[PDB]
From a paper:
We determined the full-length structures of two members (Fl8CE20_II and PpCE20_II) from the carbohydrate esterase family 20 (CE20) by X-ray crystallography that feature an ancillary domain, inserted into the catalytic SGNH-hydrolase domain. Detailed structural analysis identifies a so far undescribed catalytic triad architecture which lacks the typical aspartate for polarization of the histidine but instead reveals a precisely coordinated water molecule mediating contact between the His and Asp. This coordinated water in the Ser-His-(H2O-Asp/Asn) motif, as further confirmed by mutational studies and by determination of kinetic constants, is crucial for catalytic activity. We therefore term this active site architecture a water-mediated catalytic triad.
Fl8CE20_II was previously proven to solely act as a de-O-acetylase on acetylated xylans. The ancillary domain of Fl8CE20_II has a β-sandwich fold, composed by eight antiparallel β-strands, reminiscent from β-galactosidases of the GH2 family (PFAM PF02837 or PF13364). In both crystal structures of Fl8CE20_II and PpCE20_II, representing the only structures of CE20 enzymes featuring the inserted ancillary domain solved so far, the Asp (Fl8CE20_II: Asp513; PpCE20_II: Asp518) carboxylate has a distance to the catalytic His Nδ of 4.0 Å which is too far away for a direct interaction. Instead, the Asp side chain contributes to precisely coordinating a water molecule (Fl8CE20_II: 2.9 Å), which is in direct hydrogen bond distance to the catalytic His base (Fl8CE20_II: 2.9 Å). The tetrahedral coordination geometry of this water molecule is completed by interaction with a main chain carbonyl oxygen of Tyr334 in the ancillary domain and by another water molecule. Moreover, besides coordinating the water molecule, Asp513 in the SGNH hydrolase domain forms a direct salt bridge to Lys370 of the ancillary domain. Thus, Asp513 has a dual function, i.e., a catalytic role in coordinating and positioning the catalytic water molecule and a structural role in binding and orienting the ancillary domain with direct consequences on substrate binding. As expected, the mutation Asp513 to Ala in Fl8CE20_II (D513A) resulted in complete inactivation of the enzyme showing the importance of this residue for catalysis. In conclusion, we could clearly show that the active site Asp/Asn side chain of Fl8CE20_II is in fact, crucial for catalytic activity, while it is, in contrast to a conventional triad, not directly interacting with the His.
Numbering used by the authors: 19 to 640
The structure:
C-alpha cells in the first residue's frame, strides 16, 4: 500500500520475533514517509523508499516479553503482546499439515490439557500465484496453544515446538505454510526453477488466467455431472434404502474390511450400500457411543436406524463418528453405509478399527455385512490440481516471509515426488539453496523428514521407488546445515498419514538441538558414512552412532548384500561398535549392501542407544 502505514499480516499482535539478533520489521507507507518506532523504550526511525516500502532492524533482544511496538507517521499502529523466541517456518505436504485433531487417538491427554502461551502459531492461507512473488497474504493471525486452538495445529510442528520450548525455555513461533499433495517444484522460486526447464516452462504456462479458468470449469462440470448422474441412478436413493426398516435379508454378503472388487460386483465404480444388524445391550442405551468405521475409499454417509450420523467426502480421513444418546434402541438396531467410489477399488481399508465404543467396552463390527450395488458409474477422472503446478506456492506462501528473521525450517515432503525419485536429490537441494538465497541469512538450518514406511511388506530383496526417494533425502544431507528425521519405524503400511507425529517432532527437535543450537548431543539417526570390502565381508561405517549401535528385538535385520551380478540376498549383519559387518555364505565377492530398502521394511531394526533409528541406505548407484 501507499496511503498510510500498513503492516504485513505476519507482523501483528501476539507475534514471535527472533531473539538474539538484529531483527527485521517491515511494511508499507507513503513514498519517502518517515516512520517513527518506539520499542523497549528506545526510538527508531526509518524512511520508506519511493515505492512506499520500509524496513529496519530492531536491537537484538533476549528471549521473553511481552513488548509493545508503537509505529507512527500519518497514522499509528501499536503491536501488542510481542515476544522474542525462536521462529520456525514449517512447510511441506500432507504430513506437515496433518492437525492434532487427526492424530487425537494417540494424544487425548495432550489435547485436553494443552495450554502454553509461549508456543505460538501462524497458519498461512493455502493458495498460489503464478504472476508474481507476493509480499503479503490475505489473512492470518498469531494464536497461542490453548485447548480451544490445539486441535487445528500441525501435529509435527506442535510436538517439535513442545520439545524445544521444554528444553530451551524460550518462546517458539511456528509459521505453518504447507499444502496437501504438493510436489517440491511447487515450492521453488522462478530463479531456482531455471535448473529445471520442464518445471520453469510449466510455471510460465500458468500465468494465463484464461487457461486456469478453462481447466477449472471443465473439471468442475465433469465432477458435478458425475455426482448428479450418480444420485439420479442410485437405486438406494430411489428406493429409500437408508430406511432402518428396509428388508436387506435377501442381499449378498461380504466381509468388512475388504473391497467389493472381490464380490460379484467386480471392479465397478459408483455407489454400493452396506447394512448390518447389531445387538446393543440395555446398558449401552441413552449414552453417547463412538462409531469407528476405519477408512473408506472414497466417500461415505452412515445412518444408524433412521438417523444420519455423519459423512466423509474423500478417502484419507479416518471415520470417527458419534452416535448421540437416544438413537440406539433396545436390542434391534441397523447400521447403513452408502459408499461412493470415484476411481480405484472402493471399499473398507484393512487393518483399521470397525467397532462401536463405550467407555472401555467395544462391539466389533468386523465380519459379515450385507451389500448391494446402488449405481454403476464410469470412473471419474481426478481434477488438474492447479495448486500443485511449479512455483505457485513459493510465490504466494513463501515469498511473503523472506524478510522475516527465522531460526530455521522444518520440512516434511516427498510423497508426491516418490514416482520420480531420480531427480529428487537435485530438486530438493535446489529448493534449499533457492530459499537460502532469498533469506540471505548468516545461517539457515533446514531440517527435513525422511518418508515413513508405507504399503505392503515384501519377503525378498527388491527395488522400491519409495526407498529411492528416502535415499535421495538421505543424500541431501551433503547440503550444509541440514538434518533429517527418520520415520521408517513409525509409519503405517495401510495409511500414508500415520498418527505418530510426536516421534517425528522429537526427532526434528534432536536435529535442531545439534544443527541450529550447536548442542553437544547426537545429531539424530545413524547415517551411512562409508564401506570397506574385506574378503566375504562388507564393513559399514556410520555417523551419528552416539553411545553405540544396537538392534532392537533380535539380530540386525533387513540387510541384503550383492556381488557384481547385482542380485541381492538377505545377509547376516553383526554390530562391532559404530560399524556393521555384513556378509553372506552364498556370496564370496560382495560389492554392495542395502539396508531397509523397501516400501515397508518391517524388520529394519538398527538404532543408536539414544533411540534414533538408522536411516535406510544403499552403497550402490545401480
Ligand atoms: Ca494492537
Ligand atoms: Ca519473471
Ligand atoms: Ca509426482
Ligand atoms: Ca551433512
Amino acid at each position: 500500500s501507499s496511503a498510510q502505514i500498513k503492516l504485513p499480516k505476519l507482523v501483528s499482535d501476539g507475534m514471535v520475533l527472533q531473539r538474539d539478533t538484529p531483527v527485521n520489521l517491515w511494511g508499507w507507507s507513503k513514498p519517502q514517509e518517515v516512520i517513527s518506532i518506539v520499542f523497549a523504550e528506545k526510538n527508531y526511525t526509518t524512511r520508506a523508499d519511493s515505492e512506499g516500502n520500509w524496513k529496519l532492524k530492531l536491537d537484538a533482544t533476549p528471549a521473553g516479553g511481552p513488548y509493545t511496538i508503537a509505529l507512527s507517521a500519518s497514522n499509528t499502529i501499536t503491536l501488542n503482546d510481542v515476544v522474542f523466541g525462536d521462529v520456525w517456518l514449517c512447510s511441506g505436504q500432507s504430513n506437515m499439515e496433518l492437525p492434532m485433531s487427526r492424530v487425537s487417538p494417540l494424544y487425548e491427554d495432550e489435547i485436553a490439557s494443552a495450554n502454553n502461551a509461549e508456543i505460538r502459531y501462524f497458519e498461512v492461507p493455502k493458495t498460489y500465484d503464478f504472476k508474481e512473488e507476493k509480499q503479503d497474504i490475505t489473512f492470518g493471525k498469531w494464536e497461542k496453544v490453548t485447548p480451544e486452538t490445539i486441535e487445528n495445529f500441525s501435529a509435527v510442528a506442535y510436538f517439535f515446538a513442545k520439545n524445544l520450548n521444554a528444553e530451551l525455555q524460550v518462546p517458539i513461533g511456528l509459521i505453518n505454510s504447507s499444502l496437501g499433495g504438493s510436489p517440491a517444484e511447487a515450492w521453488i522460486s522462478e530463479e531456482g526453477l531455471k535448473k529445471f526447464p520442464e518445471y520453469y516452462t510449466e510455471a510460465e504456462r500458468f500465468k494465463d488466467n484464461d487457461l486456469i479458468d478453462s481447466i477449472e470449469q471443465s473439471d468442475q462440470t465433469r465432477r458435478d455431472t458425475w455426482y448428479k448422474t450418480l444420485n439420479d441412478t442410485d437405486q438406494g436413493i430411489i428406493n429409500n434404502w437408508k430406511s432402518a426398516d428396509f428388508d436387506f435379508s435377501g442381499w449378498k454378503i461380504m466381509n468388512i474390511p475388504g473391497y467389493w472388487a472381490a464380490t460379484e460386483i467386480g471392479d465397478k465404480n459408483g455407489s454400493v450400500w452396506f447394512k448390518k444388524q447389531v445387538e446393543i445391550p440395555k446398558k449401552w442405551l441413552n449414552r453417547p457411543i463412538k462409531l469407528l468405521m476405519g477408512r473408506i475409499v472414497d466417500a461415505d454417509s452412515i445412518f444408524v436406524n433412521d438417523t444420519f450420523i455423519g459423512n466423509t467426502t474423500y478417502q484419507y480421513p479416518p471415520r470417527r463418528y458419534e452416535i448421540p444418546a437416544g438413537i440406539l434402541r433396545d436390542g434391534k438396531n441397523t447400521i447403513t453405509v452408502r459408499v461412493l467410489n470415484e476411481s480405484g477399488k472402493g471399499g473398507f481399508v484393512e487393518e483399521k478399527p470397525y467397532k462401536l465404543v463405550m467407555d472401555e467396552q467395544e462391539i466389533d463390527l468386523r465380519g459379515k455385512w450385507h451389500y448391494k450395488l446402488g449405481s454403476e458409474m464410469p470412473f471419474l477422472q481426478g481434477q488438474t490440481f492447479i495448486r500443485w503446478k511449479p512455483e505457485g506456492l513459493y510465490n504466494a506462501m513463501i515469498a511473503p516471509f523472506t524478510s522475516m528473521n527465522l531460526k530455521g525450517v522444518i520440512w516434511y515432503q516427498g510423497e508426491s515426488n516418490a514416482d520420480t525419485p531420480a531427480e529428487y536429490q537435485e530438486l530438493f537441494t535446489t529448493l534449499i539453496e533457492d530459499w537460502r538465497s532469498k533469506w540471505n541469512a548468516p545461517e539457515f538450518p533446514f531440517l527435513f523428514v525422511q518418508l515413513a514406511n508405507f504399503m505392503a511388506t515384501k519377503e525378498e530383496p527388491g527395488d522400491s521407488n519409495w526407498a529411492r526417494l528416502r535415499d535421495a533425502q538421505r543424500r541431501t544431507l551433503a547440503v550444509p546445515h541440514t538434518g533429517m528425521a527418520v520415520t521408517i519405524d513409525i509409519g503405517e503400511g495401510n495409511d500414508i498419514h500415520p498418527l505418530n507425529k510426536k516421534d517425528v517432532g522429537d526427532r526434528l527437535a534432536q536435529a535442531a538441538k545439534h544443527v541450529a543450537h550447536g548442542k553437544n548431543v547426537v545429531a539424530g539417526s545413524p547415517l551411512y558414512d562409508s564401506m570397506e570390502i574385506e574378503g566375504d565381508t562388507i564393513i559399514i561405517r556410520f555417523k551419528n552412532t552416539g553411545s553405540g549401535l544396537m538392534a532392537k528385538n533380535g539380530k540386525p535385520g533387513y540387510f541384503a548384500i550383492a556381488g557384481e551380478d547385482q542380485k541381492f540376498i538377505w545377509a547376516d549383519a553383526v554390530i562391532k561398535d559404530d560399524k556393521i559387518l555384513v556378509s553372506s555364505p552364498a556370496i564370496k565377492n560382495p560389492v554392495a549392501v542395502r539396508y531397509g530398502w523397501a516400501d515397508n521394511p518391517e524388520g529394519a531394526n538398527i538404532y543408536n542407544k539414544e533411540g534414533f533409528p538408522a536411516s535406510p541406505f544403499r552403497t550402490d548407484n545401480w
